Write a protein that binds this ligand. Structure first.
Ligand SMILES: [Mg+2]
Ligand SMILES: [Mg+2]
Ligand SMILES: [Mg+2]
Ligand SMILES: [Mg+2]
Ligand SMILES: [Mg+2]
Ligand SMILES: [Mg+2]
Ligand SMILES: [Mg+2]
Ligand SMILES: [Mg+2]
Ligand SMILES: [Mg+2]
Ligand SMILES: [Mg+2]
Ligand SMILES: [Mg+2]
Ligand SMILES: [Mg+2]
Ligand SMILES: [Mg+2]
Ligand SMILES: [Mg+2]
Ligand SMILES: [Mg+2]
Ligand SMILES: [Mg+2]
Ligand SMILES: [Mg+2]
Ligand SMILES: [Mg+2]
Ligand SMILES: [Mg+2]
Ligand SMILES: [Mg+2]
Ligand SMILES: [Mg+2]
Ligand SMILES: [Mg+2]
Ligand SMILES: [Mg+2]
Ligand SMILES: [Mg+2]
Ligand SMILES: [Mg+2]
Ligand SMILES: [Mg+2]
Ligand SMILES: [Mg+2]
Ligand SMILES: [Mg+2]
Ligand SMILES: [Mg+2]
Ligand SMILES: [Mg+2]
Ligand SMILES: [Mg+2]
Ligand SMILES: [Mg+2]
Ligand SMILES: [Mg+2]
Ligand SMILES: [Mg+2]
Ligand SMILES: [Mg+2]
Ligand SMILES: [Mg+2]
Ligand SMILES: [Mg+2]
Ligand SMILES: [Mg+2]
Ligand SMILES: [Mg+2]
Lengths: 77, 149
RNA sequence: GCAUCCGUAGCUCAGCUGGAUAGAGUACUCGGCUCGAACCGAGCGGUCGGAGGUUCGAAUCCUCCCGGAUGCACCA
RNA sequence: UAUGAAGAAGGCCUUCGGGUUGUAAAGUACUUUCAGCGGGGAGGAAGGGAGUAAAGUUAAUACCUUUGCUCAUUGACGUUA
RNA sequence: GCUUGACUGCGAGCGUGACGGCGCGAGCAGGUGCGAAAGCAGGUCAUAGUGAUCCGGUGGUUCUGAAUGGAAGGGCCAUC
RNA sequence: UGAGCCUUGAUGUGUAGGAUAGGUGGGAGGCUUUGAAGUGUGGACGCCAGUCUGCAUGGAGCCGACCUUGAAAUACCACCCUUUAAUGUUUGAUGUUCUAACGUUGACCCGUAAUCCGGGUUGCGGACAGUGUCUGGUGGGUAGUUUGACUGGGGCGGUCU
RNA sequence: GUUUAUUAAAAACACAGCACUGUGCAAACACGAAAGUGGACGUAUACGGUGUGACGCCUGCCCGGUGCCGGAAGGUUAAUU
RNA sequence: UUUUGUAUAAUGGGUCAGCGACUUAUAUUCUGUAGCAAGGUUAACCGAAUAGGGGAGCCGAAGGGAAACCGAGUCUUAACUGGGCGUUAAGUUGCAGGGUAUAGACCCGAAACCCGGUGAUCUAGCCAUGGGCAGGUUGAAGGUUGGGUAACACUAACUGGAGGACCGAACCGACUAAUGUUGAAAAAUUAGCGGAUGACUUGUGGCUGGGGGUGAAAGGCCAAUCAAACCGGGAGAUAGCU
RNA sequence: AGGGUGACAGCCCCGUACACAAAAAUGCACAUGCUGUGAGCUCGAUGAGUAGGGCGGGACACGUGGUAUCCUGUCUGAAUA
RNA sequence: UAAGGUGAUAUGAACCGUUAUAACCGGCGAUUUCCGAAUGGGGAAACCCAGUGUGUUUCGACACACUAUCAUUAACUGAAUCCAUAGGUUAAUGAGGCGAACCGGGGGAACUGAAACAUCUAAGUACCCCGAGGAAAAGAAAUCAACCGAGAUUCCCCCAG
């Protein structure tokens, strides 16, 4: 499903407003993208379904560090 | 996306130069080909250590350069035994090989490559100034004479 | 409720692009010639939307209005 | 190297009008051969030596000598092409 | 002819509406105008010319100001 | 290739004129081997009037400057404006070429007894496409509703203070 | 031929034919939050939609209105800055 | 019962028996009553506990003003001789009752909306695999053999067996009329009628699910129910109406 | 206390008040023994794509309102005793 | 614990007991067909069809045991592709389903009220889904206060309509 493998972002629900404040139910989905990340330690490309916010944290945290948390999370990358 | 160069990629600079660059560039091209490394605490310090270590290498070599220089610069004149010039005109040329051997026997070892015979090939007999390019820039100066054989 | 812009022979418009002074086509008169068509050139037909400012000087720039337009807003 | 005419001036001739030098210059773009300097860098280098291991060679295959190999090799020119 | 009473704060007592409300009002205080003054003037001979509340806008205001000093915002007055 | 900005230079006629005085001042100063003025056209711009000025040129000159001019002058210095020529910068606009993201419902290999899927190889495409957030337009495609009362029944007509 | 099973079998619907229009195939379109499937294991001599409704003779005029298509200079205009 | 008005030929009721509709909680106001009284009273809780404790609070004894503030006064205004609101007047806590408020709010009754499920054993379409269609006619193309042509074309005869072809049983449909209408039957029977090798019909399975399906299209059909199925839930929806 | 007994039972019966009961299993609590478990002191360190912000919503009694605070789909992004 | 006793409709028959192995009650075991998470495969639930291994023999067979999936862990092997990795085969553990309400979380109406109706109300209610426990959740101040202080969370009465 539409779940980020790094941040865990999942769809949330809200309201469409209007000039008359009419509220209609909607969904907010993450900006997910399938990317092949180069992991140096295994000299391999591993494909992850990540959000755009997740992409920013990968540079800051390091590719190895995030995967270590993923193995702790048992997300089965 | 700060990243430390490992070579002279395009115009980004040269090995060991943290530079701000668009994420994509390194996120999928520079790093997976090994042309550079992300600018992280561990990596940056190691490269800066490599930077300062080569600076120390530069220091040490140029330090030992002035060593050789002074060793032989201050006087340290040497003379060689060349076939009696006979009223002048020497009976042979004094080449880099022979002149290097002379200073080497004195102790200060010099390779002929380094030797630079200024304004001539030591043709006359008697005293004649010389010079030695001890280092890549440092210039020296030695007095060399000639006598009987 | 603001913000911007426009106003010039009868008409359609240049604005004499922002002060060192009004132009054209059309309307009309005469003429050129010519039965009318049709052609041409002169002449005539504007004080420049109005009122305050500035400077030695603005229809032209400033203030104020009038009329027109386009915008905005917008849930008494 | 190209542009470059006011056919510059000046020179010389002059039929005193001119022409000639001559787009030559100046100027304005352009390029840096070689020579300046600096930094790299072939080729000439085959060799033997030291070792090795096998083979031929023996009474002993010791002696050698033939292979292969292994390590370290050498350039006067030469601040080389 | 001269003028701004088309005044400000109020208002005894009345009228008329189911109410919201609407109408009339001598007199009082402060300041005016016209008259020499007595006096008259709180718009127009009178009765139609109009729209509650909420929300927002403008001016004024020592009323308020979520620890305190301000401020925002709110209140009140004038007013759209 | 636009453009905000970088600095420089330069530009500045009412007329009168002293006229290449934009305005605004200070302003008898100015002027000066640093080369007195200065010759060589240095050109540009501009009134094509004139002006500054490229390197030499020679050797003491050089200049405020009355009628007038609003003003008093490219004598003079400061400060702005205009005109801006070039200069870096900072953002964009296209166009071209790449590959490395991404795409492949192209080929091939493996998982594999497999027209799925995944991985690998390769080709093609490629910073598009596609997707997310935000946003303009469109949208009976689909919803939630409204669509008044009086009235010789209602509707129509008329009326509502 | 089909249709209102249970008051209407028709002139209604369908029909072959005709025309317009969309669609270049990871097709349009449709069902699906999506994957995917149908279209189609088809490829414009194909498929979808629309109207007309064998055949015969024919199908005139209007693009102002409303749609659709093409154009893109200008006017106006969102998020953003 | 409803009405201006009912013996009314307006509604209701075959009869009896049973059942069947003004309640409950909290808060508030008013009346009655009891207690205490410028005071009254506790709530939760504690507690051998209907006591007692607990005064946390609540109401009242002081109001005026938007408020700051002032205060038996206060506001309005510069100020009121003024005017508005106040100042002599007992309240409070139980109990009962009359009301109100929030809850279904006396009871019964909608057509509907929403949510989650069950249904294509009926029917509609489609898919797969099987079956059925007596008998009798008409006699296409093609073919053969002649005649004709240079060869065709063409023509004749004979073979052939084409068709959403013909007549007509099974089968399928359902046009007319009669009967039947508290039926034999919640759609049929009788006598006639249409199709009857096809866009036919049928068996057995399968698939499409409710704002959806399916529909040679009637708003038809989707379990005797369809301009939005059935079941349960929201739910005792709501009902200025009877 | 109740129930039963041929009609209404303190003394008919079963019970009730009291007084007692567990081979075995088990709850609870205390004690205790093992198996882990680490107490204390000093010196350090002090949670970053986070807080905050822009955009769109939601939650706080509080409906964007002048709206703090909390959660974040999106785009950014600190200080750090 | 016992002089009576073989459950009921529900008699009867044939019997068992009477001083402690009748019966009855309790504790602990044994047995516990088939279906059902159902687990060897399949299936129209209570049925159909096996494989492996051990042990039986009357040579026709027979009796037990094991064989689901997923998660986790560890071994062994094992691609494209050299290592690797994916993958594969075993072995251990664990989970599967059911069940009243209460709880946390993920989704989430409309009727209705507003005398209509959109904001709002109903209501984060009904319902659906996930997960857990005997309780759950929350919880040890980047909290409140107001210049005085309080000192985690939860619950009740007030504050207060
Ligand atoms: Mg050279
Ligand atoms: Mg009058
Ligand atoms: Mg405050
Ligand atoms: Mg509608
Ligand atoms: Mg509604
Ligand atoms: Mg009416
Ligand atoms: Mg009505
Ligand atoms: Mg027919
Ligand atoms: Mg019918
Ligand atoms: Mg039918
Ligand atoms: Mg019929
Ligand atoms: Mg038709
Ligand atoms: Mg036509
Ligand atoms: Mg048109
Ligand atoms: Mg047209
Ligand atoms: Mg009567
Ligand atoms: Mg009667
Ligand atoms: Mg008490
Ligand atoms: Mg007290
Ligand atoms: Mg008073
Ligand atoms: Mg009382
Ligand atoms: Mg009462
Ligand atoms: Mg037929
Ligand atoms: Mg027929
Ligand atoms: Mg027939
Ligand atoms: Mg039906
Ligand atoms: Mg409906
Ligand atoms: Mg129902
Ligand atoms: Mg309800
Ligand atoms: Mg009801
Ligand atoms: Mg901290
Ligand atoms: Mg932020
Ligand atoms: Mg926000
Ligand atoms: Mg508001
Ligand atoms: Mg406001
Ligand atoms: Mg806020
Ligand atoms: Mg099984
Ligand atoms: Mg309503
Ligand atoms: Mg438990």
């Amino acid at each position: 499903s539409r779940v980020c493998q790094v941040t865990g972002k999942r769809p949330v629900t809200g309201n469409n407003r209007s000039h008359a404040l009419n509220a209609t139910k909607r969904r907010f989905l993450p900006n997910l993208h399938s990317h092949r990340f180069w992991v140096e330690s295994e000299k391999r490309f591993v494909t992850l379904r990540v959000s755009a916010k997740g992409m920013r944290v990968i540079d800051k945290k390091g590719i190895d560090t995030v995967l270590a948390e993923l193995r702790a999370r048992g997300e089965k990358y | 996306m700060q990243v430390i160069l490992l070579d002279k990629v395009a115009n980004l600079g040269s090995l060991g130069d943290q530079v701000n660059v668009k994420a994509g560039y390194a996120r999928n091209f520079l790093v997976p080909q090994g042309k550079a490394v992300p600018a992280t605490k561990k990596n940056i310090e190691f490269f800066e250590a490599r930077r300062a270590e080569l600076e120390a290498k530069l220091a040490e070599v140029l330090a030992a350069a002035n060593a050789r220089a002074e060793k032989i610069n201050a006087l340290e004149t040497v003379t060689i035994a060349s076939k009696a010039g006979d009223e002048g005109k020497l009976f042979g040329s004094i080449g880099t090989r022979d002149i290097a051997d002379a200073v080497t026997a004195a102790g200060v070892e010099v390779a002929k490559s380094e030797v630079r015979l200024p304004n001539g090939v030591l043709r006359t007999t008697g005293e004649h100034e010389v010079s030695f390019q001890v280092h890549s820039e440092v210039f020296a100066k030695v007095i060399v004479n000639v006598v009987a054989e």
